[model samples]
Target: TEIISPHHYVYPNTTTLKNKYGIKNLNAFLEKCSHDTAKAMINLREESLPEYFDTAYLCHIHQQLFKNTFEWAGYLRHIPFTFADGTTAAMPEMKRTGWKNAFAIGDEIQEGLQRLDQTLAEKNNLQGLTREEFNSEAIELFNSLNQLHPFREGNGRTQRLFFENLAKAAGHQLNFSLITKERMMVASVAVAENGDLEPMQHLFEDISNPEKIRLLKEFMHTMKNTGRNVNDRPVMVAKEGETYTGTYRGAGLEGFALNVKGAYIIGNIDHLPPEQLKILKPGDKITFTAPKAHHH
Candidate 1:
């Protein structure tokens, strides 16, 4: 791959000048591809099955979604991609496996996925779990699979489709899907290293659905309206005065000012007490807390 600014950063594709979709440019191409893939995935979900929760299913998802566009749609990547900043820098096979044995390693990973599916099925006991139960189980699967990072291209999208299927089996659909590009990079990479699931788990908890049923209705109409799927994660959002508990990654507890959306702590994000809040500095976690809403 050539070292360029934007193009190198985008995923490598092997399409010719003429696309069947008549799309132009990487921007248009990607958008059309996503829309097509979304349609295919929605169709698949309409015909959903618990039996389709294995490696084959994921492979099929990737293949169907991208095969029309990329020659390398459903296979493992041959290269290592280390993200520039806090994002993942994953190898072809990660730890406990290597490049030569990539697909072999993935088979085992998928088997584990299957087992987890069955286990979640059993836990739900053929009925929907309450929010608390869904949260714990959803976090477990999310952290594990995201660390697994099975596909080079579509891991996040693929993971959500599979996960919501698990949620469906549990008698619910997770409307609480919001994630940060910066945050996921930290959590999944950490999990890839130490198997610590806390960062991702916390992020999941933060974005979990408060009005589960109503949001489910919103998601139900999503494909027709916003071109999103059942668990369509919002691109972003932050409330004005909500206190989110986090592990601090900044230093000295006083690096930045207060209450700005997208304000970042250095490493682990954290919640600070009011006194310590003033001391927030570099290497200190937490950006700022929203002031409590005043009734006046």
Candidate 2:
């Protein structure tokens, strides 16, 4: 059995150091791999192009960065989560894709990326977007690529660099130097969880040099036939056999209103406790309790 360290057990003898650095400690090997890869990628210019829309391009980048350090550099990881927390409740849930399935899953992600590549094609390889389009496309592309998470490690950094290329191709410089790692991590995690892009989009806007912004307000769109997001706040009536509680936020608002019998059966619909949320069955209603959500 391979002991990566005295305390760490990993696959036996999985070292692939082409340079004969002979690093055996798992953490040490990883550190060296990242260091070497970063150095390799540091000098490249944006115009140094790949096909850019395909998975081979993605894998090629990984290979180029880490070929000296790891065998799986340009390959889809057979055993997923080569360097991640992996399937924790906190991380967004992707399926348990086995090594056998990684190829297919990689293909799927590649296809999705190709579809997104269509958006930036006419914009001169993403170097020509207007401010509105850039922000919208930033959110869209980040959402798409993060879903891929194709690499075992360096996924985040590589993808960030990848998107910066998109911005460069679009005629703007993406200044990631303006943001801290912690700040970007938090916003990114929120996008994966809450499925909200506003946070990331905000960061992208601040970092986009030649920032093209337009916030001209218009209430002109007619929602005459529309229900939600319209001239009225949506109110939903509960159907028989189930009850929903509103989310508890703000000051003096209790978790959930009690039944007349004085028991918290289902608490806080919006921010439901698992016990409460699970009891709600299929086709259950969803609605907001306030006038509406307000934000920047």
Candidate 3:
């Protein structure tokens, strides 16, 4: 009897995963075929598919996106393998969560996706929920699928395409292009490290509804006496030893600002707490504990 390597997907003596085109070079494979072909396929499949977001639909997305580049396209990985990125934090989560065996991972993915589908069904596919409500639920759902990373390749792209359609069907927009790659990476890394979904949630909130964001920005700026008239409306002030809730308006030179009871209060971006600062959006509620001192 012979033992088999779990990393059998890659070509012998190279980290490159086997592909349809037999392209051994990672850079060439990524540069020549990765983005263009899959994106085109995504566009073609866009008008079709109607309203579906299940495991089979997810696998169909993976298949359509990578059909031109990989033979495995829609199939889940049958062997265990690590991702190419140098990030260490995700490995712990990945490995500890049955990344060492394919069947276990597959079982987990099946069960997890079924659970997610149940959740979606319960929420009526997230229909009629506010953007904030949608974002919170979407983040949790996305995180569950993300941790699975079921396919050997194109997981990110497949997930994004599936999520875009899911969000669209639910009357929301989820544009991944609006988020920076660095911002996306850190948010993902944070989740892999600490299971904190706030960063990802924040990113989703910003990108979820660009039209509304633009409209709100214009409305805020059009209010000529916003600052002066804030006092007239009984603005909520930050009192020491109490938690305050506010609606995040936007950011400016002063810092990230939030509307608390009709007042636009700004906190310096550098000085603001990370947990509160990074998760805010134009209409999302933010809760923060007031510190003892108030400075000029």
Candidate 4:
């Protein structure tokens, strides 16, 4: 297995950028990014990246690529999209719309990288990683990228390229030759909707199976006909007191359509008398019994 460096193989332009940043031996930075990316991906299988990575290291990785540009911050400005939000409209409506937030985004990038380095340095207990560990870490890195929502555009594509390099670096030949955009989107949706790793795991399994290569190719062909852009809608649930509001596709509560009065009632439903459910108003707070689990 040849561990391909992402800086060298996926984003060679970054090598020049590293040189510009006064980083000696650009290959070292490339190896670090590739190694870190792989580790993050595998970790995401079982645990979400720490909040630190989400906020800080994410920006750090991009900073290395963009070198103090506003691009990374602009990206975070577009997060938390919902179905009805107009924020998503300001951007070019591509799957990637790095938003504009000059200060916070840049700061976060620096912070995220520092945090990532610290976390990586803390890995002193594990003797070594196995194949399963590698896969898990790889998925974690992918999820972290998704959460970080790095890059103004081309995040998924960039991640795929990065992951391919990681695979090579880990001594395995990656066969994303069979992966299609649709499959990637579906896997992403599954992660967002259920926070489950099964879909992605299965996707990887297919990629590794010689016998399933044909099936993978056919799947890709069929996916091309469907032709749907990546959906950026945020998932939301109606709470008591809150009326069912329309949702937005971008960050904050911007596109949420709210029945303020109804929302009040739902919020107070738990603490108020059954009769009080009718008199709830805006700015009121209430507690209620948590719903019982239906599946387990």
Expressed as tens digits, the lDDT of each residue in 53-139 for candidate 2 is 445556667777767765546754333322221121111223553531122253565566566566546444554568667767677
Error in Å for residue 225 of model 1? 17
TM values, all candidates = 0.50, 0.52, 0.62, 0.37
For model 4, residues 1-296, the per-residue Cα lDDT tens digits are 22322222123345332222244455775565556545544543343323222324344344443333222322333343222211221122223234421212434544554554464445421114555666666676566555544454435544564555555545443466565465567677778667788768756655644434443344334436555522232211223232333211111111111223232111112333547434645334333332333456
What is candidate 4's TM-score against the reference?
0.37
After superposing candidate 1 on the true structure, give the runs of residues whose Cα lies further than 4 Å from its correct spot: 1-32, 41-52, 71-128, 193-196, 212-258, 264-296
Model 2 residue runs over 4 Å out of place are 1-10, 13-22, 50-54, 78-107, 117-124, 210-296
* Model 3: colliding residue pairs: none
List model 3 lDDT by residue over 1-296, tens digit each.
12334455666688886666778897877776767665766575556755656777888877777777766667766433333331111111234544322222546766777797788878877877988888888888887777777776677778887888888888888876444455566678768767777668656755675633443343335457655423233212233455667887665543455677665443445556667556666788876564567568
Please state every model's RMSD to the true fold in angstroms. 12.4, 15.9, 12.3, 19.1
Give, for candidate 4, the lowest lDDT window spanning 10 residues: 248-257
Number of the predicted model whose lDDT against the real structure is largest:
3
The best candidate in terms of TM-score: 3
Better of 1 and 4 by lDDT: 1
Residue 236 accuracy (lDDT) in model 2: 16
> In angstroms, how far off is 179's CA in candidate 4?
1.9
Cα error of candidate 2 at position 155, Å: 1.0
The alpha-carbon deviation from the true structure for residue 231 of candidate 3, after best TM-score superposition, in angstroms, is 41
Candidate lDDT values, in order:
0.51, 0.49, 0.63, 0.42
